[PDB]
Symmetry: D2
Subunit: 241 residues, 4 copies
């Protein structure tokens, strides 16, 4: 049983709350920028005021930096964020000197494992053509997904030349070996599917990750918290947790 | 079994020859641009004595002058050149003989189109995305087969808009959009997927070709059915 | 705002309750075969006693047929059943003379459509071998799923001869044309996937339904209820609701 | 441009001939146990007689051991065989002292890559349930496929207490973490597809190899040959080539 402090209480930490309680953990406090009525937990403005806490789970945004600026707490921190990271990472870097700090932009251990599996696959399949596909719900505007970009980056790090091909319609060019076709499917409520296709001579290898729920990220944070609580002070990612 | 006349003798009618003979049929004649070939060479369709049917995989330059002549034979026509003028001549000939035309000779692909036709009115609240995959030598995109599937949807769904590239487009999907995706790589013979994505569920219908023999086999299947037809114009829809 | 009577309070109607309340509907009663203290709604034994109910939602099994045997009530009924249905459907027919009655085995419009798409596919694909696969979470004990059996039954109705084949490792016999291989994948938290494979000469056609959440069934029922309350008396399915 | 000697001219080396010529390689000779006039290449009885060969590709059987018994040749050898291997492997060991020798029962490089990708995946996904599926044409009698067995063997080497589950129909047992479900799909002319499913909490990872034709084995031998000519004497498999 962990006593968990939630930094932020948006959609993601609402998932964390539900799943943590299912696992027998307890939410002992919430720190939010706009403390909401009907948030069913004790509200705080400082980490140090939440006694009993074993760990904090923080799906961060710029408005949730404030509790990390206090200098009177020592607590395991599990932190995620998207977009701007520099200021936050500088602060987490400082905090890691005095407590265990875990950071991952993407909290899915499955997606982390996918990237490592892809990394292993690439040098083995250098003669194969690569095509990347992602599918997401019909509310997603940006294309391609950040996760597709992450997979693409893994490939780039293991290839000499890579050229992304976003649309073949009326392109009328012959595929070249450096090309990687990028395909963004949108529809329904699809949580997130990512496929790496390797196409060779009369054989293909496909590696496909399919998310069933955004609970994968909440669960990822909780499972990270469960490992972090016993770690010495320092900075941790999925690579060394 | 059948006695078959082959109009044109490229890769595809070579497949037809191999596959027809394996089925117990015999190739009684070939009409070609520049002859080579283990079969008897003809210049006219009327010349081919005991022919039951012609299977055509050629081009307008070879076919059009042959159609303009005086003959009576069931025709399986797969030529995809100059569709407008070809269908005009095929229409005229169908008054006097059984005439089958399909731009795509795969019976599996036909079944896919009919399965799609059934699916669409049943899934009107589902978002439709079309994906096709082909080998790394294919230049045009999307495939003609994807276009055929899209045409089926258009006939059954109002105000359809195709969406080809979402990268940096920054628009929200609209229910009338159909996303179109062309995968290229390796030696993939041809795979076509229709995705219907609804609230918390998906239905996918996928055709995957293992060999171009499906097209040759489809033309043979059409020929076998066509010899038992009255005069008229046929496609897989009414054959 | 509908006032809903729940017939049965297993996992599915528990989900219906949560989703219905989220939508602003009210659960005004429950009828259970064996009432539970943990059931947080007023227990009843007869539909006629549930003052102010607008509709009943019934994920049925043989132990929940009982309230449908009363002859002193008039209420819109939304009824599902995954097992045997003859007895139930005979009763629903009789009830439909005096009230609106909606039936769906699974309460998923998508799964219903799957069966109809399959029905269209079978006669077109006479020369194709059929294989049926389903995948479900690691807590599912029965195999194959009732939905696979439903698909199998559709195929049986459209073919002269069908033989189910369950274990080719044990059998070690070459495939016969009448054979339909049945495959049951279990793992993780997979909500439910069903695939029909048609395998022909040098080509295959696959039809695959994938459920992302059991919400499809519970929302299916609620949406059917929301509509049925404004229908005249009679029997309705997804085909004619 | 490799000059290739074919040992045997059955279906597989007929594929090698076509693919080699496509790649711009040259078939400089054929050694057959019973020479046939339909073989469109120069027939030989001894490897040493073949003018300018760079490599031999040998899809072996008991009737094709004979050219390996000569003691007057030094040539890179790429060799496959099915079933009984002892006598052949003993001879290849002897030859490997004096020339580069490559042996693989399965010549598909894609299949080798799959096994290595699987090996990387397993320790990263130890909280995921594993299910193995293979699909083959309707003439395949044995189930499961040898390739599925090889994948299962990889997993056994990296787990403990693994148990295969071949049929869940009417079994009525809950899945256990050490279980691996085994599924053999048979239909049409499917050349061979193998899937490893890893099913976790609200996420799955699938790794799938799909063969389009038996050219994959022929191409694999040619690819092995292209690499082998640049090796010193020794015995090689895909693991150390």
């Amino acid at each position: 049983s962990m006593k968990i402090l939630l930094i932020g209480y948006g959609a993601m930490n609402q998932r964390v709350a539900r799943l943590a309680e299912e696992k027998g953990h307890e939410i002992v406090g919430v720190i939010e920028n706009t403390p909401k009525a009907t948030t069913p937990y004790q509200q705080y403005q400082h980490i140090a005021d939440v006694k009993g806490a074993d760990v904090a789970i923080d799906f961060s945004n710029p408005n949730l930096l404030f509790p990390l600026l206090d200098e009177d707490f020592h607590l395991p921190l599990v932190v995620a964020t998207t977009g701007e990271k520099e200021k936050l990472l500088n602060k987490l870097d400082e905090l890691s000197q005095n407590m265990p700090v875990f950071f991952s932009a993407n909290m899915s251990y499955g997606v982390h494992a996918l990237t490592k599996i892809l990394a292993a696959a690439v040098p083995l399949l250098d003669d194969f053509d690569i095509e990347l596909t992602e599918a997401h719900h019909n509310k997603k505007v940006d294309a391609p997904s950040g996760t597709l970009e992450k997979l693409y980056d893994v490939i780039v790090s293991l290839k000499e030349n890579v050229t992304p091909v976003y649309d073949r319609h009326e392109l009328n060019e012959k595929r070249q070996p450096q090309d990687i076709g990028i395909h963004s499917i949108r529809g329904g409520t699809i949580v997130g599917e990512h496929e790496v296709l390797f196409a060779g001579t009369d054989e293909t290898i496909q590696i496909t990750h399919r998310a069933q729920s955004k609970d994968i990220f909440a669960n990822g944070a909780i499972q990270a918290a469960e490992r972090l609580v016993n770690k010495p002070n320092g900075f941790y990612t999925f690579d060394n947790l």
